């Protein structure tokens, strides 16, 4: 169980903070990562962290934009987004980084041409 909160209409240039709730597991031990699905687009991975919080991660789109944060004691993740632009609107999802995939070494390529 996880449970995102915080999203609304932003002007551009605009702040937002985005919570996920967790429950049912053992969220101190867990990397979790939020991933946005732009409207039409597919599954797009946007931060992150470490379940200490000691390691964060960005993609490039976001880098220096948005911060990646963590509450052991509320077990809740939170992603601060500022300097909002127009390819920031999307649905936001927070996700246990590895708990379904791999991502990151797994795939195969299959190429129809």
């Known amino acids: 169980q996880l449970l995102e909160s915080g999203g609304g209409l932003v002007q551009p240039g605009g702040s937002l903070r985005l919570s996920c709730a967790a429950s049912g597991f053992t969220f101190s031990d867990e990397d979790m990562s939020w991933v946005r699905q732009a409207p039409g687009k597919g599954l797009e991975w946007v931060s992150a962290?470490?379940?200490?919080?000691?390691?964060?991660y960005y993609a490039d789109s976001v880098k220096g934009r948005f911060t990646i944060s963590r509450d052991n004691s509320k077990n809740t993740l939170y992603l601060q987004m500022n300097s909002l632009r127009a390819e920031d609107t999307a649905v936001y999802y927070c996700a246990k980084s590895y708990g379904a995939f791999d991502y990151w070494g797994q795939g195969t390529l299959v190429t129809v041409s």
């Open positions: 962290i470490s379940g200490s919080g000691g390691s964060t």
